[model samples]
Target: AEGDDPAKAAFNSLQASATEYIGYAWAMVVVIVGATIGIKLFKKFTSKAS
Candidate 1:
């Protein structure tokens, strides 16, 4: 970076934060969907209740 300009550096930092937040949001969505699918599979493998 070389400390070129404070304003540009600040904008870059803001953009980086926004990108990371979007990535994290998507990750959470995947995890939740995966958990639901796993739950359904688990039920299929279990024995029938009386």
Candidate 2:
């Protein structure tokens, strides 16, 4: 029972850090891809405007 608490705490910490990093990495990928596609579409549509 004594060692279980420390082991659980360590596992929880590892999970939290992993999730945080995954969130940051995916968020960046989504924003960059979204911006790139958005720009291409906008240019395609507005090419004759000016």
Candidate 3:
């Protein structure tokens, strides 16, 4: 048509940033959960050894 739509471009930029942010958030969640599980397992193993 003319050049490009400003409103549509803004929405696309927002959507892309939101996707990246959510991926970082979930990766953090997974890392924390995994660390917690590993710590618990290590404690159990040590207690059994004693």
lDDT of 1 at 33: 84
**Candidate 3 lDDT trough over 10 residues, lowest sum:** 1-10
lDDT per residue for candidate 1 within 1-50, as digits (tens), equals 67789998999999999999999999998999899989987887784541
Model 1 scores worst on lDDT over the 10 consecutive residues at 41-50
Candidate 2's TM-score: 0.64
For TM-score, the strongest prediction is 3
Candidate 3: stretches off by over 4 Å: 1-3, 46-50
Taking all chains together, the TM-score of candidate 1 against the true structure is: 0.55
| Model 1: lDDT to the true structure | 0.89
Per-residue alpha-carbon lDDT of candidate 2 for residues 1-50, written as tens digits (9 for 90 to 100)? 86579889999999999999999999999999999999998998898676
lDDT of each: 0.89, 0.93, 0.93
TM-scores, one per candidate? 0.55, 0.64, 0.68
